[model samples]
Target: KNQATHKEFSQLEKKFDARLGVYAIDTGTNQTISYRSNERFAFASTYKALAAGVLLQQNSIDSLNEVITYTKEDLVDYSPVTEKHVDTGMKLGEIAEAAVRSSDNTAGNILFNKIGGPKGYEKALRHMGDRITMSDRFETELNEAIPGDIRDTSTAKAIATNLKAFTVGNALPAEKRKILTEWMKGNATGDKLIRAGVPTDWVVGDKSGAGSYGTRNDIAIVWPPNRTPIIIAILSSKDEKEATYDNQLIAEATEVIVKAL
Candidate 1:
């Protein structure tokens, strides 16, 4: 492992015929393992985790209990959980949580807009000391995953750094961080990716993203048996035309990183 050539990562990328990027850091020791971690890839639905953090940090934990009402116009296609609560309404925090755990599009649009849109989200990241993460469009349009477009993109390194800050760093109040962590922990969409690589006994929370051009990304916070926290991000994309994503690439890549650790 000390030889410096990460052959496992290169082989995985070739096997999947896609670009792969990974970043993992031990929060206690600040040790990092990375491969193409600086290259940009579309954020997909992963930004919901950050949006939820901004909401909790700006408002208190009490906001999670505040009910939000919306009409039919408030929804768009792919709304998932949010569309189901149109009549009964949902709490602000639950809306944010649903956006993460279920990848609710309507909820995502609502939170993204509430956090001051793309520019506001960017400012929030900058305020948190982030330099590479960026968002330029809403959920619906941002998932295009255009072959060469860099809009609404972030690097694996940037996401891991920012995620570590949001989840474990003092960027948010203790209670607020706990709330967001729970939401990520309960995410139902990541079972086959990062979740598949780590030991089931280890505590982990993750957000998953999937879209065109084989874009499949997973951002996770893991606690090993020793309880030391680690932030891991696996972002992969296929540049080929009409190619779909292979989640195993992320799982195998995650195995290489975690096994190395």
Candidate 2:
């Protein structure tokens, strides 16, 4: 079963690389797979997860309740957090919600700016010994032929490492880790890759990215029944119409891995 599963996933990895990087690690079996795992690929809003983690690590959990105003200035076109609801102030918790659940570029930008923007993010990443690099600007170029801008770029390996850290509470305190994990459970962007592969009974908490020119990425944690956690990260792009075909490949490969455990 192990050998067959490895072979199946190996072929799927090849299909994923027809475009971008794909990296996955199964802690249970100590198995690692990749295609351009070290190559830098656009992170899109997935970077926001790190931002949220940093914030929780920096501040007290009670601070999460503080209400911060959300005004029209906070709004930007093509962003999930639009100006429509900017009239009233939102809690810092809400900002975090908008940042993760909605993958709100404006909210992320606001948090990015609040935490000293890109420089702060870089500083925090460095402090954590993370090598991934992201662009300074926000992704608000919906008018362009591409649905979004390439503001942030990250390597598959770096993302997988980050997930590993988050999973084991290596980066943040226990309270902070709980907050980050809880927030992830509520992620709004639901492009299926991880969820499709796992059974309904399993708890799947993850963040996904999708954009023009065949961009699809999903970083996930699968808590299967009577088993340990499984972490998978897949990112790809190509000239395909359905865009999600890569996810199917990921699902097939991951299904094999899940069954093996």
lDDT scores for all predictions?
0.86, 0.67
Kindly list the per-residue Cα lDDT of model 1 for residues 56-170, writing each as its tens digit.
Answer: 7788777678998778887977888888889988988788988988989889988977789988888999998887876898878888788768888999999998899889999
RMSD of each: 1.4, 3.9
| Clash-forming residue pairs, model 2 | 69-89, 112-117
Tell how far residue 157 is off in model 1, in angstroms: 0.6
**Winning candidate number (lDDT):** 1
lDDT of 2 by residue, 236-261 (tens): 66554444435676566556656665
Query: Scored by Cα lDDT, where does model 1 land?
Result: 0.86
What's the lDDT for residue 76 in model 1? 74
Cα distance off (Å), candidate 2, residue 109: 1.6
Cα-based lDDT at residue 151, candidate 2:
49
lDDT of 2: 0.67
**Alpha-carbon runs more than 4 Å astray in model 2:** 1-20, 78-84, 141-151, 186-188, 239-250, 256-261
Which stretch of 10 consecutive residues in model 1 shows the poorest summed lDDT?
1-10
